[PDB]
Structure 1
Amino acid sequence: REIVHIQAGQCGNQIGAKFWEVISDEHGIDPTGSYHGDSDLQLERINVYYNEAAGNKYVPRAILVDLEPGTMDSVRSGPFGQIFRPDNFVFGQSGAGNNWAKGHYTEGAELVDSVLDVVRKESESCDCLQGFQLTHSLGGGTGSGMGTLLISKIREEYPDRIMNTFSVVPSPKVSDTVVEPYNATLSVHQLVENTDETYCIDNEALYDICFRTLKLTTPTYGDLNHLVSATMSGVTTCLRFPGQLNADLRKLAVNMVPFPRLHFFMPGFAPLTSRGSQQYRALTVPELTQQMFDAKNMMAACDPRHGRYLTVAAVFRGRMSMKEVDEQMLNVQNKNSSYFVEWIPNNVKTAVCDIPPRGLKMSATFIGNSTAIQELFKRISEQFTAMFRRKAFLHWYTGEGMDEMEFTEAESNMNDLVSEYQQYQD
């Protein structure tokens, strides 16, 4: 089958650029689009993410959306300017400038069709479309505006396909805009209703991980995006080669969403260690699960141990004993029975793929549906409230035709989300 990858906004584009680096490397694809890998399984499911153009040129099944020419230019000027197809570069009038209404409601709305036409072109090149993956920020304006804008449009076209997104969440201590709550609140309002699964990633959390575990002196965005891309791959890596237990976006959703609306997930990645500490690694399934269930290795800022686990997905990579894995899963649930939600018998869904990440002997990725995430929503809601009570910055959206009712409705609906997570926590 095939999956469409859409990138929206500078943040999403930079993450996606790193993502396509990673998986192109994974599948033996060079900077011309030519295949020079050593395995045959790299071509077994290459169709998932690549069109096979004449001459065996493999072309990212991806759409590049932005409203700020220049970022798009940096993409074309980068190593994958020879990889991405030119008619997938969609941009026009200047960007929203952190104005969600410009991104979703007005200026971005004008260019929707120029995206959807490409969506259709991509769809009709597929043998079986499984779903969509959106990569964007949750506060940027364009990425968050065009994000939910396109999500709505795409679902209208493909209501029965899987809507997946990787969203960068407003972090307590890592900012760059004072309307981050306005944009996030307006975005999530439409996100929930039109999304099947969404991942919440905090730059702050990554900033912590990239030092606490990776000991990076100068953690750059390219390193934080790199962490993200690793988990992005893991989510769908099971679809691209053989394994003892298969997995899927649908399979995950079936085992990760117990209550329709609660489809917000925390992502994590196994072996996190600095290059000087790698020599002390055991590389065992035990070791991996110690990291996977370590709160400090979660890429959401909220620490899971303030909430409970509605359900967990543990996707493993490489040769390993199925019993060994099962044993560790049991040990974990026995260890922290107070953390796992008792309403679920087996709180952990597992999967095991036969191929580790090139260069690793054995890896894994972690997807958690915890109730703790409600606290991130609370924090943002409070920031939103404080500003909204004074109608701060409201005229930036008023001038685009946005009323107060939307903002109060969104917040009311945000409260419902938190309330639901609290409903299912003791």
Structure 2
Amino acid sequence: REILSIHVGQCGNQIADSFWRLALREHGLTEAGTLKSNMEVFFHKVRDGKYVPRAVLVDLEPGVIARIEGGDMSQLFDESSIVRKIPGAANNWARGYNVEGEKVIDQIMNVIDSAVEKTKGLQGFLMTHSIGGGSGSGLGSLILERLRQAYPKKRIFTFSVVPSPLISDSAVEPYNAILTLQRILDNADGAVLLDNEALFRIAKAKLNRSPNYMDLNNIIALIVSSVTASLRFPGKLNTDLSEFVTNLVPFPGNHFLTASFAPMQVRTNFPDLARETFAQDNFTAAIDWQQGVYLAASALFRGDVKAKDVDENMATIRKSLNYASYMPASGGLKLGYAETAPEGFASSGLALVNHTGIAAVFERLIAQFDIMFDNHAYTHWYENAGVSRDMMAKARNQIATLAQSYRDAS
């Protein structure tokens, strides 16, 4: 039960600066990698003191890791657990998947394979990226293929960051989602879709300070950790990564999860954390609500959360929630616990929610794809770099199926 991690793209590697500074805090390690709990999950025990993490910092535009391995964290990561190559998967899926992807994918896999042959209980892949760019979404789409083709019986959890519904942040970005959300739907066993519009808002209510993408990622980096902290801080109701596919993914397409965190050393009395965990504004996606009923919610409550309270709290929450008609009365919500909170908090909460609202994220990214693909509106950057319109409309016909697969799941 030792989870490999992949951090592809500038969006993913910037989470890796947030995640491996929170994974070292929750396991109680210093920034160099030595000892200041199941530490075997994230960290490969190289020596008696030093714990090198099981992360590939796979990246094009090698200035992101120059921030990481320049300042304070060069001693932590192993440099045979990385790739840095120019050019930079030029916010272009076909650069990241085909042009500058095939240059690195032999090095990516043989660094993954040199990190999973050191294991001794490999279970998962917390592959962290965005579906927006060209490195996180292009090479992230390529790794998901090659990793499922190499490990077809291991759970591959994709921790994506959706393009914002607010504005673009990249011009060709609705192309890069559907070219990636295809390969997530085909290979990954469950994806957590996160949204920088919700990551702005929830961090805006968190801090008395206007956020930045280091502060946004600490919401993600807890969600990346809280999913896999019933796997390493065991407690009661041990929820491994195999139970986020059997419990939360009803149909073979509906595996795009909307995760919240609460509280947003911070203590919380916990009849209100469950009201904070399943707040509609605390879910980290712009999912639909007035035309949205859930499929399967989760609740990983970590720290000083005793299980008697959820018979009164969570049964009250699930009455307040909206599930599909084919989910039972008090059922439909799995639970879990950890015996150790994150450092800085005293009782946390997570909620992977599989919901029809995430199809509104899909319907946005198809309605943007609908105008933009038929008018060839950035298509020649894919065509002149390997990927034709046949390969791109076929990416739409799965996501248009997937946006229908939640509307079939109501």
2:251 and 2:305 map into 1 onto residues whose CA distance is 32
- The 1:217/1:321 distance shift into structure 2, 3 A limit, reads closer
Gap regions ≥5 residues in structure 1: none
| Aligned residue identity for 2:116 | S
Is 1:135 paired with 2:128?
A: yes
| Aligned residue identity for 1:214 | K
Corresponding position of 1:240: 232
- Find 2:179's aligned residue among 175, 186, 196: 186
Q: Partner of 1:97: helix, strand, or coil?
A: coil
Query: What displacement does 1:385 show?
Result: 1.3
Query: What displacement does 1:341 show?
Result: 1.7
- Find 1:340's aligned residue among 301, 319, 323: 323
Corresponding position of 1:420: 405
Matched length: 408
Preserved contact between residue 295 and residue 303 of structure 1 (Cα < 8 Å) = no
1:358 and 1:49 map into 2 onto residues whose CA distance is 16
| Aligned residue identity for 2:345 | L
Corresponding position of 2:16: 16
2:47 and 2:226 map into 1 onto residues whose CA distance is 29
1:409 and 1:151 map into 2 onto residues whose CA distance is 18
1:89 and 1:402 map into 2 onto residues whose CA distance is 27
Q: Residues 14-413 of structure 1: matches in 2 within 5 Å?
A: 14-36=14-36, 41=37, 45-211=38-204, 213-272=205-264, 283-336=268-321, 339-345=322-328, 346-413=331-398
Can you list the C-alpha shifts for 1:23-67, whole angstroms capped at 9, x where unaligned?
10111111221112xxxx3xxx11111111224210011101111
The alignment's TM-score, normalised by the length of structure 1, stands at 0.93
Query: What displacement does 1:175 show?
Result: 2.7
2:243 and 2:137 map into 1 onto residues whose CA distance is 27
2:168 and 2:72 map into 1 onto residues whose CA distance is 29
1:320 and 1:247 map into 2 onto residues whose CA distance is 15
Can you list the C-alpha shifts for 1:62-99, whole angstroms capped at 9, x where unaligned?
10111112222222113221100011121223112111
Query: What displacement does 1:305 show?
Result: 4.7
Q: Partner of 1:344: helix, strand, or coil?
A: coil
1:132 and 1:358 map into 2 onto residues whose CA distance is 23
| Aligned residue identity for 2:152 | P
- The 1:71/1:242 distance shift into structure 2, 3 A limit, reads closer
Q: Partner of 2:51: helix, strand, or coil?
A: strand
1:304 and 1:48 map into 2 onto residues whose CA distance is 36
The alignment's TM-score, normalised by the length of structure 2, stands at 0.96
1:343 and 1:151 map into 2 onto residues whose CA distance is 32
Query: What displacement does 1:303 show?
Result: 4.1
| Aligned residue identity for 2:270 | V
| Aligned residue identity for 1:113 | D
Corresponding position of 1:2: 2
Preserved contact between residue 341 and residue 347 of structure 1 (Cα < 8 Å) = no
Gap regions ≥5 residues in structure 2: none
| Aligned residue identity for 1:13 | N
Q: Please tell me the root mean square deviation across aligned C-alpha atoms, in Å.
A: 1.5
Identical positions, percent: 39
Q: Partner of 2:209: helix, strand, or coil?
A: coil
Q: Partner of 1:185: helix, strand, or coil?
A: helix
- The 1:328/1:305 distance shift into structure 2, 3 A limit, reads farther
2:186 and 2:95 map into 1 onto residues whose CA distance is 21
Q: Partner of 2:272: helix, strand, or coil?
A: helix
1:413 and 1:186 map into 2 onto residues whose CA distance is 10
